[PDB]
Design a protein around this ligand. Structure first.
Ligand SMILES: CCc1ccc2c(CCNC(C)=O)c([C@@H](C3=C(O)[C@@H](c4ccccc4)CC3=O)c3ccccc3)[nH]c2c1
Ligand SMILES: [Zn+2]
Length: 226
């Protein structure tokens, strides 16, 4: 998160810190959010050979009693996820066991309504990702308020699609998500409407987020069958 503030510790109890393991390189990092006691929603590009989930964290360098380190049994990447266009950047992680409910750890279930969110309003995003283009990931959970932009603002992303994705962040403001934040939620009036996906390498807003409303049928399908 670039240009944000430190979250009040444990104020977003659904937030998940993801360590992504692969065979031929060191750990990489994403965000996610707990939508059921044994399911975390995140981005498909965060898939790996294996993934570890930490719930209940604020400062990720200091072990505390709120931490729950949880094993992932299976990854459900969207079947149409495309590494060229980056369409359908969404994935569900099934946890080996159900998380414990505490003050610091709880679910963020979707409401029944699944209306299409138009441009104009302000939303908030949180994560442990880089605090600048040339800076390291944050030790503490950070968050920032970003504006939903008209789709033409994201035209320069040639594979952007208004029906599939949200266009997020006023170009005139030095505020954004960045690397390490992918997979985290964008909340609009307390409701998750987007998932952090991708933007420019230089972090100039706006950036591209998965539009959750479009994927509600797929999400429901996976949850009901698993
Ligand atoms: C919205 C905020 C924002 C803005 C810009 C980016 C970019 C930079 C995108 N640069 C391009 C596409 O030119 C990225 C890319 C990136 C990660 O997510 C990190 C990563 C962690 C775990 C597994 C794999 C990778 C390491 C990395 O390089 C990335 C890679 C693969 C597909 C999509 C995104 N994420 C972003 C998020
Ligand atoms: Zn604490």
């Amino acid at each position: 998160i670039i240009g944000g503030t430190e979250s009040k510790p444990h104020s977003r109890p659904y937030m998940a810190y993801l360590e992504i393991v692969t065979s031929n390189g060191p750990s990489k990092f994403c965000g996610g959010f707990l939508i059921r006691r044994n399911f975390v929603l995140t981005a498909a590009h965060c898939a790996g050979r294996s993934i570890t989930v930490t719930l209940g964290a604020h400062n990720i360098t200091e072990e505390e009693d709120t931490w729950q380190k949880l094993e992932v049994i299976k990854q459900f990447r969207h079947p149409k996820y495309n590494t060229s266009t980056l369409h359908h950047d969404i994935m569900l992680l099934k946890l080996k066991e159900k998380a414990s409910l505490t003050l610091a750890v709880g679910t963020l279930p979707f409401p029944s309504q699944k209306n299409f969110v138009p441009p104009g309003r302000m939303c908030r995003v949180a994560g442990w990702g880089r605090t600048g283009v040339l800076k390291p990931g944050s030790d503490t959970l950070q968050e920032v308020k970003l504006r939903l932009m008209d789709p033409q603002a994201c035209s320069h992303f040639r594979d952007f699609d208004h029906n599939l994705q949200l266009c997020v962040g006023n170009p005139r403001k030095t505020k954004s998500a960045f690397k390490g934040d992918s997979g985290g939620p964008l909340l609009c009036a307390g409701v998750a409407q987007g998932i952090v996906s991708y933007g420019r390498s230089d972090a100039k807003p706006p950036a591209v987020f998965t539009r959750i409303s479009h994927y509600r049928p797929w999400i429901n399908q996976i949850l009901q069958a698993n």
